[model samples]
Target: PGAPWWKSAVFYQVYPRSFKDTNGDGIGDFKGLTEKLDYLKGLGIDAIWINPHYASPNTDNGYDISDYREVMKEYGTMEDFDRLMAELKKRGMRLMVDVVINHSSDQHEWFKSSRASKDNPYRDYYFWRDGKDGHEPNNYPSFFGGSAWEKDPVTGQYYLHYFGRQQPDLNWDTPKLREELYAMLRFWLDKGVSGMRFDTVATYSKTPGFPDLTPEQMKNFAEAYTQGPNLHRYLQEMHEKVFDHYDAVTAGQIFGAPLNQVPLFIDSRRKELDMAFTFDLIRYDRALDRWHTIPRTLADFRQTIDKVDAIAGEYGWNTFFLGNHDNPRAVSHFGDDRPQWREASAKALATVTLTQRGTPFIFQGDELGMTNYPFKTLQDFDDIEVKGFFQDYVETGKATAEELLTNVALTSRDNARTPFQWDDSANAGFTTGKPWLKVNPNYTEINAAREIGDPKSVYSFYRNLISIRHETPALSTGSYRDIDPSNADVYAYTRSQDGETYLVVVNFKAEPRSFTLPDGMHIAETLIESSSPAAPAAGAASLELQPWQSGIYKVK
Candidate 1:
């Protein structure tokens, strides 16, 4: 782990669209990001991972990048982006932009030209296949709900897109396209930006031959839309051509992939990426059928964490995450949908992940313990994925459209993409004008400006938590071992390094739970407690955890 800058570094991910607005234009801009630099610095974070601010049609809220070189006018100018990077660097912080090379926006010059005609010079740049019988190539479905292959009537060929039809997947099989992507990556590294949070990186490599899905599991396997054999070749190229030169830190958004495939994608010796986000913790919210049924107990979450931790430990590059721009808020996922457990859950989750043997990534508004906002209609939704699901799954009679729409209201991308709650003032101090997406109405009760200085506020808890991670060596890179996964009310684990041991216990239950120390260990010091104080002196083997309480203790 020589000079692994990310070992102890904590990252804050900023979704640019909803971070801040400077011109009262109802949209966040680069200037607003610059203005908030001091705020991020104050939070004591070492780096920031911003979602795409590149030119786009907003079809997928900037994941459908049109131009890698230019900033969208809605965000700001390229100069502003450069200035922002410089300012962050000057402040001893790093920045990572979202890189979405899996596909480009339909409006992108490359796609426009590729779609112009079958023999266009850029036609081969995308995955263009002759439509079978003037229809889609097969029954394969896109993640955005219907037909993974979209036809260009003018060109008379179909192109692949795992997401919305507007986002055409790149032809990674083409050597020239891979080189071009490397060139764009080099451009960013040359600008002194730290690195990139690779968007849907694993999806770039489609399985060989692009064969139709087997008829039996066609529906299930087709929806994966990821992990083709060619992904490794593309990643190795990216590493050699660009990331290797910059020594950049990359964390990919990896989902719908095999559990074993992660190690191959993130081996440090191979130098593909620093680490990637795993969706195991995220999928806990989805039901067996519907994607909205939240898990009702702590055991469910603990089991998920344990499985991932074991698997990641087997692999060299460990992963980290709790929430991001695509999921419902962590607070709502782990708490009682109230403020009581929100801050505690933040601290608990941080304590667990940061102390594990990996890098830690925090999403925007997470430091303030932001929870899901209440929304009730299609009009309230803004993400392409949610809209597509509503129309495809619900409207098509697979499920009741009204019920599914309600589920979207509870846990749609809109819940995560709402304007950041900065202060108690109008619009949570995110904008002077109405924000592009509605701000959570509870901003007055939960906001950064109000919590930053408060000793017991969520913001302060996170600041201190990150400081502890940086200053305390044992917590930075330690061996992690989980407690009993069968405990319905407890999510507990231990972090040990060089004879120093720390125990973290989280009670996700709303009722009190009693716990006994694991065999020969005894609590030595109570470092941080999110609920009832740990009674170390009185404990030989027994201790009690209050509802949603979290305790971090030194063990011997």
Candidate 2:
């Protein structure tokens, strides 16, 4: 019913370590990110959701936060962060920092003290369990594939880590710990961050008694850990304590929250968050085994999109994204990343997502049609989650090394962790020194420097689409209706608002498709088209689409 600045804003997610490197450290830092502000501004994003730069031991590439108040030494000092903030402010861009409150690095002071002795005041800051039957407390496995509980040799107790052994889950059940987290949140906002992207937020609360899980139940341990009792209460308290005072936008990365219950987490009236991300679409191609990849079809994609659209229609907000730091590049994952169709497919995917009735998020390098790196072996992967799975499953003989490697190639988070392809130089010009990760070989042709200069490039296509969304209010507040929802290859939808309607059509296949206009529909204008194909004559009954083509038309 109202227009919030975030509702119409375009967000670009920056994976700091992979973005750029300024001091020849081979890892991206605040200085490197600061240098790219002008480039980001040129891309037409209104804000950026920067991945974690907080102090960390880095078991999970910054996801394992060690200190909330300090910047990672490699990233830069507090002064560098302030300077970056000032630069972004000067350019009228907002910054949304990643808040990793669900867990902390084992090296964090609270965790350190908690692990030192059972009598330590901070001992209750994390979940500690006594051994059951002289063995591990539960059968539940960590997201990385080992027992979720890790034994402490000194304390004679086990602490919980949902993801990595280095990241111990914080005890939301502890009032002092929750208060500390709330204060840290305010610390960032007070430093002038416009918003927060809460990482694994739904896992903050946990069931009281540490219970064992059956094999089938262990597979879905997230359900046991996420959206637990008192979750909404904690969120409400957080809002009252910090978010209520600022003109801030918050989005939560909700893992394991059931689809039907998602609205409660982000409903405007609920005051919890501005939006929440659901992985229904991303999970479509993932096999239930967790280490196997499956082929995804257009029908599956359409169903997920339509379901989300319906939910957003009832809920009032949604976060639109195709790829992020934990996933493969969008173009490579969902579109044809082959040389001949890469540009067209990337543009098509952008058109489909950007025109939908939600705030769209662009992951770093996505604007340039970046593809997944050619990962030849397990050694090429650096993500602890991927490496852990390979060790647990492949080495243990549960799955073959080839099968596991194949799945890792298709779905490893490292695919999106490659250094950004800035140019055709060494390390894609990301760093003068050796990069922390490999750069995609296609950087020679797909670098931003090349695409930014080419009007028909994928980067240009994204810029144009973002501009359209900003200028067209109908796109931001539109009502979405699926057209030809059951069509396997063509995704067509209409977005209408304030008496204005726009028709978006996308061909998800590598072949031509013929789509006939509705009985009474008439094209008012050909707003944007991905390929250089001519528009059909004003009132043509049917239109022939090129391979992987996308067209957005104003309709009357």
Candidate 3:
């Protein structure tokens, strides 16, 4: 009934494999993260949300789990996890680990037994069904691409995989399976983790019959699979049987969820989730074809964010973020990443994110204004999303391999998966050995080593923005109001808590823009209340913001 720490906290996402490497394996280990705590504390976050680090086969970058209770040998042993937690605790931060229960790798022992024989007791643990007319049980396309059904060689039946062939969607209807998963969840909470980020919680329950649909219906594929019959029932059971007893917070990846129905998943009275991530800002620019681009105006971007905030305010708390392991860099996608505007644009983006009405997440390397990778060809890429995007286009005769290389490089998840640039040294100081993925070439210019304490650096600007939020109750617990909802170049808003208010404005473009303050508000001597990330340029007219500039001011 009261507020929670996560309601006002800032979260940092550490894609463990890309964070840092130790033992010369070129893969980031738990030990590597423990070694970087002070740096994270300096960034001013309250907690960390690491991508799946459970024992895995490396498919989907660890989303495909082989073991639930043990740590991946590549990431070190359980002792390393304990040490990392102890280190984070010492610095006044907490850990939020990933919980990937939507699916499991084909290598999982449960999956192995389920595929062994039709009469096996574990056969009901996953979706195992006979095909119809020598075709798949349904024509549903995989989120990755192609048919969602895969034929099991030994059993001669088809198993359902929402993403890849090696990953099978679990049958959550089985009480036994739910029991096992709930216990696995308690294993981490008992270890003192702060919370869990449930992967695809909305997609856990499959449709009643896995029915085939028309081509047009396939366009709504995501909605068709989300909000299945038992999603809420299972979630209610989860909270009551597991998380309810602990003091842990939870967020779910409800990506394709309908806006109105979203509150049902997160209304505290319902007790399903703390927040349901409704992320469209990072992906709305893409065409439905997945390979083509759509032209979305600044107003559209601003409104989309407003829609999310509206739902968040009306019902549940929100998970505010711009980038993650599955998406491209924030600056590249949402701001001007060109050389001259890079740092300013990064600062501008940070200002909006931190000043919003909910929890904000900053991904690794984004603080340095990291841009998209300059991938020249398919050979230079290593992401399954790229491969899936490529395979779907080529095999469907919709596009040629050469035609996609441009967009692939533009939107590939691998751009965000590159090693964190610690310095300008060889391998960007991420590893002494060869890296699993090549380090971005711009590491020499935009590594964390270059921005730590520089007054004008993007890192410094971000830390300043974070500190402002930390001290300003309005930014976190306030009511949000948009100033110019129809403006196409600049976004302006006010956040008010109790009687205090702050005006936040940003130029989302590289071109200079003049903003008109609300009638009663005055353009003060200083743009921000105390410090300025970007004030109106000297000698410029009042309320004029320079290219990619942003400001936060106390409202009269």
Candidate 4:
């Protein structure tokens, strides 16, 4: 009764296109996801937030939805989807789908009808504007690059596209479109889907005017419309008409909200979102973006996590995720991905994530401790973001090739989009045909089949870690308090509920680090820990932790 089921549940994100290819068409399908349900359930996951499997041309993976209600032909049919839902229900797991309401694939029938003629009734379904100075309607730069507009040859008018030319932004002001999207939401929820993870939820409402941005403002083109005037109004309507009736969880990917404004989106009374997936930690210590990066330190991580945690706790709920399809692997991003400390660091990240005071999302392959892809140049990558950045930065001479290559190698979304390493066999047992993306060459060493039986493997650690979270009421609803606030290499905190307290410590460095426990508290017992903990004794005044180690201790 403390909170909704989602507050304590664990969610695993399934990137459908790269998860499992059952039909051997070199792409994953619903049947493939159904095949992996046991694997996900064994990892103690309570819910899965899968990527959009709607009809698309794969321009931006599945982000551009061409058909909202129909399954992509490559991803199997609606029957396969029902089977997946049935299997998931049998396993006591919930399904959360990606709600890509911000934009639609230009191939969508609505867009086709919208561009047919200015007088068409569907013309208001998407943003259509008049050209300015024989160019784009405005100077808004697409998130990828270049102008955020596409001129129609037949109509001689420009339409706004925040992503690539193939993905046109939708006009949220259209009542028919809003009702259509709501019905689609109801269609899934009525089918037993437990949640919805709205993609770029804030971008659904944009400035009505086709405004121009200055050179500096052009850098964050979506910023102007992210907090559009009508954002809350739309969410409130959506809540009253759709979300509130279903008791479904809503995790909105609100990109640009400040700490103070977060409550409006998730404060229960507002009736908007259950939680927001913040990118502050993912983009920690970065300048502009992945193209120009900075070394993320332990301090930055703590400040960001704690600040967001405190803010969200005060308001309503929090959504914890280290990495997702749009970013690099979790272990590679926040923990050491090098082979020497790879498993240890992966467990460290899991230990920290599971102990946080909210719902946690485990990215696909993260439980197996998947590492980033080794990209030598732009040619080796497949992500549109990286490729677009290369064209915008390197080709334009705005940044050096070496700089872009080095960061792309480390931070590209394709690093996390690689096929799931199910086994050491061909194509990592993901598909029989050549994969849509290159399989990580190390899949032989890092795979589910290889690690499922090993007690020391990263996957096993995650399994145990999740079990601990499920058993400990403190871990799910406890108050989080930092133990070593000033430590640079170690992150230590405590989660307490009622009188029960659990100490969580994480060593972020690749070398041994030391910290002291609280003077008054005594460890009752060790719950679950990583591979290389120093195994600090109960009541120890000073603890020396091993490289990339982490542990949870029930204290009295």
For model 3, how does the per-residue alpha-carbon lDDT over 231-251 read when each residue is reduced to its tens digit? 899999999999889999999
Lowest-lDDT window of 10 residues in candidate 3? 524-533
lDDT (C-alpha, whole model) for all candidates = 0.78, 0.87, 0.85, 0.86
Q: Judged by lDDT relative to the true structure, which candidate is superior, 2 or 3?
A: 2
> Per-prediction TM-score, please?
0.95, 0.98, 0.96, 0.97
The lDDT leader among the candidates is 2
lDDT of 1 by residue, 321-435 (tens): 7778878887776665666556666666656555666777788887787889887667777777777787788778887867777787766767788999988889999989988
Q: Per-residue CA lDDT of candidate 2, range 389-496, in tens?
A: 876897899888888888888888899999999999888899999998988888899898888898888999999999888888888778888887678888888889
Order by TM-score, highest first? 2, 4, 3, 1
TM-score winner: 2
Instruction: Give me candidate 1's TM-score against the actual structure.
Output: 0.95
What does each candidate score in C-alpha RMSD? Answer: 2.0, 1.2, 2.2, 1.5
